Amino acid sequence: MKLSEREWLIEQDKLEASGKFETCFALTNGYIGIRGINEEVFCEETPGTYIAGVFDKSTAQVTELVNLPNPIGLRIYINREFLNPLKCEILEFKRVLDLKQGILYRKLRLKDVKGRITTIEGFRFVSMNNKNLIVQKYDVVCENYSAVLNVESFIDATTVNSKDVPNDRVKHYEIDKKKDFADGIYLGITTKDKKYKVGIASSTKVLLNNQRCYFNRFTKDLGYIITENFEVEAKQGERYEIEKLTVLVSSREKNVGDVFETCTNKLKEFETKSAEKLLFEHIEEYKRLWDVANIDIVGDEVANKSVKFNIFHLISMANPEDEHVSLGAKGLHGEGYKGHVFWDTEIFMLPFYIYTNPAAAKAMLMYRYNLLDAARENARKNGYKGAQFPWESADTGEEETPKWGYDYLGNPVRIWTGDIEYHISADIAYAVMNYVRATDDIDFLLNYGSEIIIETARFWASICKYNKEKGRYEINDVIGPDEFHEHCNNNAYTNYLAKWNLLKASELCNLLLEKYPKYFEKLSKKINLSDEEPFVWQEIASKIYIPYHPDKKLIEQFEGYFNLKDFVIKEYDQNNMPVWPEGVELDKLNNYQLIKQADVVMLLYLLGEEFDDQTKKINYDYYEKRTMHKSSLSPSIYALMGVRVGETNRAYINFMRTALTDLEDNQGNTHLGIHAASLGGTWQALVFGFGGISIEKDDVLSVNPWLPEKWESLKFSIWWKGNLLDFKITKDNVEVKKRVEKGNVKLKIKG
Amino acid sequence: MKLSEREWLIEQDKLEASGKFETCFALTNGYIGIRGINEEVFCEETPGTYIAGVFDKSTAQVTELVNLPNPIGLRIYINREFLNPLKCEILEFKRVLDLKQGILYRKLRLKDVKGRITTIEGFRFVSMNNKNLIVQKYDVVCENYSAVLNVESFIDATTVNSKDVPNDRVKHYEIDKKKDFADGIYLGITTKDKKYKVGIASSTKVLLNNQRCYFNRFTKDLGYIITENFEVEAKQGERYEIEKLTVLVSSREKNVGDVFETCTNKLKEFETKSAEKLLFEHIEEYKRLWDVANIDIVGDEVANKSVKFNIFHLISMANPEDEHVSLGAKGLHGEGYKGHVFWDTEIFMLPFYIYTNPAAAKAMLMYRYNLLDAARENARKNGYKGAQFPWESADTGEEETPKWGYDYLGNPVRIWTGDIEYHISADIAYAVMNYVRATDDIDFLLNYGSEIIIETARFWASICKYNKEKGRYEINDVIGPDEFHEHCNNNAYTNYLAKWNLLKASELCNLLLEKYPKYFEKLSKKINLSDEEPFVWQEIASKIYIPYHPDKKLIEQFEGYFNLKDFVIKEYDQNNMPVWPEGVELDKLNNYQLIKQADVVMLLYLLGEEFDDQTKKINYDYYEKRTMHKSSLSPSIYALMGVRVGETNRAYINFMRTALTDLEDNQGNTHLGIHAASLGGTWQALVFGFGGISIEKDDVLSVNPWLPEKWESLKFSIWWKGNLLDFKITKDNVEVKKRVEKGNVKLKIKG
């Protein structure tokens, strides 16, 4: 294994427990996620072991992605004394995430209190090609001594969720079985709700010039921990190779009756291959993914590197073979928001996959399709019609948002997002349109897509309420993208998005009636669709209260917003993030005009075609002045609309905010997991902002870049109606190369 | 609670995990022992939770006293973040063991990274009067802030034995039950061999001016840990009282059918009393014990304090209500030698109890009596007769010595002590005589004592082998007190001790035949004793090969010893302990004349009446020159014989060695547990050495002091035939005060 080059490396400086690097160094393959802890598992680290879709409620407030037993532990002992890296003199330290090869690397040269010197060097990864597999390989040298080493692999089943919060700790599994099967050790568990079973088998061994060299292997069952141990008569200066493979299998996979037999079998297979061979296969997969998703920026090193980071995690975490899971707000990298799926996924993350690797995006939309029944059921129980998707979603598709939590002052506060942040249903509809238009995946549109757009439209129809006074439908008592303001009327974003969803749906019925009548009838039997309905949605859409006002040009975020006390940002913190104006009480945010994130501006981005350059700029200017960027969702939208109204400084400032979200820990809480929307925002800003990509009405791809001065060039690729397109953007012109063909496609350049 | 005065306090300087203070601060009441860890249980501490007599083998090499779940844990949280004392600025630290009151105390004033300042102050103890009880009480003040505190009591069932040695870790119990019974939390376990069950119930609560002030109590079952949590709205500067009682109960106690009900009931009772009330009762017990066992030294502060330490642990660890356990080589303070009972107990520890609190010594001898069947069985299986007590003894009375371990170079070595260190059987006999002579407990002698002395004599008779050449019985292929030399012939100590045991036994038969004929027949039916036997023992005793030689005067430690390569101590370490002469190979100790500890000199101490002042001094001088003091048993014997041959410097040097054994960590391994023999050696040296107590043939107590110059005075008390005697010893004369009378007793002063 040779480390990649440096533009490709992210480096931790000090050897220590780190919440931030636990997150930034999390590895995942879309099924398994492993937090970036050190191998020895220091007292203070917070391990994370997840498997997509395995959730549990038990005694907790809401269901949660389960922190499983931690399987990666590895410790060294010299004559039965544990070589503790934290109790040594660190002569050399290197620790980097290699983004090109998708591995985590560590080299250590240590000097213990008895003056012995040992180097430990190697890496781990979570196979991109083999979804159940995790691979570790470390090399040990005793530099100036001989001894008996014990190499201790272990699986630790004391892990819990919410480790550091005494009120919220829960253990979400129980152990079913522990076993030394000679070839490895096994531990398997069942969730407390009894819905999933997971099995973990693992085999370590120790070589010297490729031949097994341990004189003794023993095993220990200490109740909640099982260990596999290898004793070596180690000779000064020799190179001992440690190789540990581990397999996770869950009840979520197919024809897995006995997780114990499935694991052992699987491991037996993977063990016919070396760690190098498995790494090579791993890397081919990363090649294949980067070959399309990589994005070179010339002339800004900190940005090129940063963006690579964002993109890495994006390509690591989606698994297109899985149509029953999607991406939670923090990936598979942490327990923030507990693995729940938000609009984050459909609106911020999904575009990367649509243009980058559209199969992934298809699977993520399958996740929502498969939970239509739960969205219907959710609407029924609130008194509505259609599919009302929940604000937070897990495995079952029921609403999973907490009824309460802690505000910015650490006090209890009611949470109403799960009750009245309705826009989620439109955003999903929107994302179905958005996937389809880029892919021309008509089959998807016919069998799945249109049901979704139609069933959400039925819901918006149900909640729109008519007002004779102003002679317009309203949607009242709501929360829009700006979570700071609760129980409002006619949130602009909400109404346009509702309008949009009602319209697309009537238009879709027409398309299908005329151009696809067998499919329209398949569908009509299925969801009782009558061709009188669409007229209803049109009637409603045409009267939904949009507020302008014709001149003045300024979109009120919601009725009454302008009557609210006004504040002026001024003052930024060391990460260039807004600081609370003075006199703002953090639990009275309802009273002020400061906003948490893009809301009206969010509207301008997604419904670009409805607002002219001037309305965009007027509203962009009014709201940026007033955005606190208290979600990681925010900067990217302001970077992208920045460029689009031609304010390229505001833009680059805001871009550097989304790109550095976790690497500089902008928001103060990277330790809870990767900020996954922010990753996709970062990508969106590059491609649809600075790269000047956009979509003209009749589905013509336009390009219309606007590099920040500072960047000599920008290449990225994307997939457009089946065509894989490489753009290179210089300050002057734009190159274009169709690397894969499917029909002739219309492109429309600068200028 | 007011701390005692200072002469009475032992203090740890730095706040840290410490193997040594885990030992030195271990608290016990003779049934329960708790290692001296801090309440929070830091990553690196080694907790110890023992109950006398509960042993388990499971997958281990030999049976072991079980480290039970750890019940004392207590942590504080501020707004759900754990207040970690190791991650704070320590503004004040006090931690002392108070030897007079028998409690462990800690005051902390901390400043956490958010600048909050909190003081935590209180103590714990293991009730001397109530054997199942442990008490903790801490006071919390938030100095400069208000918050929600969580007070977290917990019982941690992840504990194992041999925590730091990967080859030897075993978990010796499994959990049977966990329970929140509203009034507390419960966890109970069963040993893996299935011989003992233990239950632990525990109840915490939190007061403010004596009234319950937590607004919420919740519980958590995290599998191998259960917690009880108390939430308080804490006001700046208020004094929150935390009080946690905990109860251990085991299957070893009587009419304990359901350990769960017995614990809960017990706790319910103890909870009708406050921590102060329980402390007061605790202290009365310590008063009562110290009132007799205390020993004032005037004019050497470091010695007075030290001796108090030694005596404290002695009075803490014996429980005279228990006739089925005795004292293991490391008390109930650690897992060194795994709670096994050696001659340490009978010869070094027992004298303290005989003279200090003779009921204790009676119970310890009951331990051996009750295992006579196992000692018979042990002799039979080696081809011998009588009772052959094992070298290491646990619950069953079978031999428990390891077949192998690691030598001084960390390599595997065969251990033969369990096969051929036979003297143990004599030492026990001896201790029975020794208890009886001080106590005049004739009843004990008749019903129990004499069986023991007789059955061991039957064994010595069986192993003595006749030699026609020298016309003497020999005992060959042996290990004597000096473990350095293996497979030797006619170890001097062994032969005199055998002779002694054969003689006492024939003499005892005579006493009983003549003066107690009903008892002699009770006994004779019981162990098939014929009045022909004693003649056999006499015949043998009179020919046992004693080596002199008439002039020269020097007792060869064993046949051939003088032909061994000779070395010269020279050079002492920073604790004034011998350093290995150069050219000595630590795994070839058989070849040299260096000895591990008192052996011939051991003989001079126990059989004083058989050697004259000159033979004593000649042999003392020859062997001290050559003793490495590589057991903690050694210094004390050399301090005591020092004074007795009149070498008072050698004496004070050696005394300061035994007294400082654990407080200065002389032997390098205090972390494994208190060196319990060394405690009793220390006492023996004071009383029978410097205090000049001795026993003239016809059981007259003589006094014949010899203070080191430096010590103005020395008072100690002792019990002699039922009379409690206070001696005060000055450089000039000796005062004496009978505080309790039982007949007139002969005393014989200086001079």
Ligand SMILES: OC[C@H]1O[C@H](O[C@@H]2[C@@H](O)[C@H](O)[C@@H](CO)O[C@H]2O)[C@H](O)[C@@H](O)[C@@H]1O
């Ligand atoms: O990325 C997740 C989510 O984060 C922010 O809002 C959170 C809200 O959606 C959630 O219901 C509550 C409780 O779980 O926490 C809020 O902070 C963000 O504002 C939101 O738009 C985003 O999707």
Ligand SMILES: OC[C@H]1O[C@H](O[C@@H]2[C@@H](O)[C@H](O)[C@@H](CO)O[C@H]2O)[C@H](O)[C@@H](O)[C@@H]1O
């Ligand atoms: O205090 C216990 C014991 O310690 C020393 O000897 C140990 C020996 O008795 C034991 O069999 C082996 C293995 O457990 O370890 C030895 O170090 C001491 O020499 C001895 O006299 C003493 O009773």
